[PDB]
Design a protein around this ligand. Structure first.
Ligand SMILES: O=S(=O)(O)OC[C@@H]1O[C@@H](O[C@@H]2[C@@H](O)[C@H](O)O[C@H](CO)[C@@H]2O)[C@@H](O)[C@H](O)[C@@H]1O
Ligand code: CA
Ligand code: NA
Length: 507
């Protein structure tokens, strides 16, 4: 069967109505939700490394970051590591890649590609330029075309145009359809400027209240690093915030945070609307063409994002809003339609599961395993009850310390080792646009554990690591985290300073 893998950029699960967050009363994704009403909504899908390039590498390879070597936004994915597309080409599929690529190297293993180029692979919201192999008289990365209009509209037209005029109608196709929205700074199409103009976006209480959240690793001893760690919505963080970026000055510091939250969320949801409106045009074409009944469709985001919760922004954090990815699959031949699923899955599991759903076998060389049996009503054999996470990009871009962690259905334990893996990067500025105006440095940050009871406290408001009545859960989770790190091979032999910190904190 055909496969269309749709992925959006920073489209987090709270901003999708089918996940029923406090934002769901705004009805932000009516078309995505309709697809979910005829498919499976995976409630426990998680990123292993919440940034675009590492997450997109885990999806393509089905392997953890330390195995594909794409640790941060600074690394490249080898052309020979394009396992997902290659495995579909082996099965006789024609393959196409459209939209945001962000894997640095050429999508050479795709028969057709037309991917975003400018701004380090992030693209532009208006008149974006693409690198494509329909201009075959040039070579990567000089095979550039220009387009007219808004990126979400242009990208949707590229995919539909390929399906209509370039696709071989007698071969099954595997298409990766990647959007650039709703990425910052959320430059929505001008036709949405007054969408949600007179509607208040529901505000979480964690935006203003953070008592019990965090530790010395994320706030410092006696809250001395509240100005230093974690970019904010309020003017808490001294160097980067939405209140400062939006130049909001009410006189009341709390109303500053509120207005910056409204602006951040409305501009963001305006981009989400543009994606959702475009998907109606794509889904209408697939239905009219008759591909709706023989095409497996996936909607996901490369990672989640903090939408102001705990006065945080962006991703990278292991916190559930950034760690969890939205993941909706419609298998038109499965009886699992209009249901939710609680299975703990990862983005590294996407590739082998999609290979088996298309009539293949889960590749042995991948860390991820197939959960295709879910679409047959079965629980996969010996499936994990825990997930591994690691953010490597210490301090850079958003002043977020590197950390590892493990998450079960009931508990989450985070270990911040607060150090960058590259010694040459230690000591250097974290934000390049403030290299002149005084940015923070990629320095060592306090090492500490954070522990959250996901059944009593799913919003992760209360760190209960120092709590004595959780000290048995604490020792238990520290054991599973050490063996999970051991089982996946992320033992940091390559990095001595980091190995000593993690090994000594676990033992
Ligand atoms: O692609 S994402 O992971 O969804 O976004 C990550 C972004 O990282 C920083 O933006 C930098 C730019 O400052 C730099 O010029 O180019 C690189 C190209 O990868 C990134 O775009 C953050 O400043 C941004 O907020 C975002 O988190
Ligand atoms: Ca992203
Ligand atoms: Na887009």
């Amino acid at each position: 069967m055909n496969v269309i893998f749709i992925m959006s950029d920073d489209h987090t699960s709270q901003a999708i109505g089918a996940y029923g967050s406090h934002l769901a009363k705004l009805n932000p994704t009516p078309n995505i939700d309709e697809l979910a009403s005829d498919g499976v909504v995976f409630d426990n899908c998680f990123c292993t490394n919440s940034i675009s390039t590492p997450s997109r590498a885990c999806i393509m390879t089905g392997q953890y970051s330390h195995h594909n070597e794409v640790l941060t936004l600074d690394e490249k994915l080898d052309v020979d590591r394009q396992y997902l597309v290659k495995e579909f080409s082996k099965m006789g599929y024609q393959t196409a890649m459209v939209g945001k690529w962000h894997l640095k190297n050429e999508p050479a293993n795709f028969d057709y590609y037309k991917v975003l180029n400018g701004h380090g692979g992030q693209g532009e919201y208006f008149n974006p330029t693409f690198l494509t192999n329909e201009i075959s008289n040039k070579e990567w990365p000089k095979n550039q075309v220009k387009t007219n209009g808004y990126s979400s509209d242009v990208i949707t037209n590229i995919t539909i145009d390929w399906l209509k005029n370039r696709r071989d109608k007698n071969k099954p196709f595997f298409l990766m359809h990647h959007y650039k929205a709703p990425h910052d700074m959320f430059e929505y199409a001008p036709r949405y400027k007054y969408y949600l103009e007179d509607t208040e976006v529901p505000v979480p209480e964690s935006l203003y209240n953070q008592d019990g959240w965090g530790s010395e690793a994320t706030r410092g001893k006696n809250d001395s690093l509240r100005h230093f760690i974690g970019t904010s919505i309020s003017r808490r963080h001294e160097n980067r915030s939405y209140a400062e970026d939006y130049k909001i000055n009410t006189g009341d510091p709390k109303k500053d945070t509120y207005e910056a939250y409204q602006r951040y969320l409305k501009d963001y949801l305006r981009c989400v609307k543009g994606v959702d409106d475009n998907l109606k045009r794509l889904f209408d074409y697939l239905k009219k063409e008759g591909l709706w009944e023989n095409t497996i469709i996936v909607y996901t985001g490369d990672q989640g994002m903090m939408l102001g919760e705990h006065d945080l922004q962006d991703k990278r954090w292991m916190y559930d809003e950034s760690m969890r990815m939205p993941f909706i699959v419609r298998d038109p031949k499965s009886k699992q339609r209009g249901v939710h699923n609680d299975l703990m899955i990862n983005n590294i599991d996407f590739a082998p599961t999609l290979i088996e759903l298309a009539g293949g076998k889960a590749p042995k060389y991948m860390d991820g395993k197939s959960f295709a049996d879910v679409f047959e009503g079965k629980t996969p054999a010996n499936w994990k009850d825990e997930v591994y996470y690691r953010y490597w990009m210490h301090m850079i871009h958003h002043d977020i310390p590197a950390h590892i962690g493990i998450r079960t259905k009931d508990y989450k334990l985070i270990l911040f080792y607060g150090r960058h893996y590259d010694e040459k990067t230690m000591g250097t500025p974290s934000m390049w646009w403030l290299r002149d105006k005084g940015s923070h440095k990629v320095v060592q940050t306090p090492v500490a554990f954070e522990l959250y009871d996901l059944k009593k406290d799913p919003m992760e408001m209360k760190n209960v690591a120092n709590d004595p009545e959780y000290k048995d859960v604490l020792k238990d989770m520290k054991v599973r985290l050490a063996k999970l790190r051991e089982k996946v091979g992320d033992t940091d032999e390559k990095y001595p300073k980091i190995k000593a910190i993690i090994d000594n904190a676990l033992k």
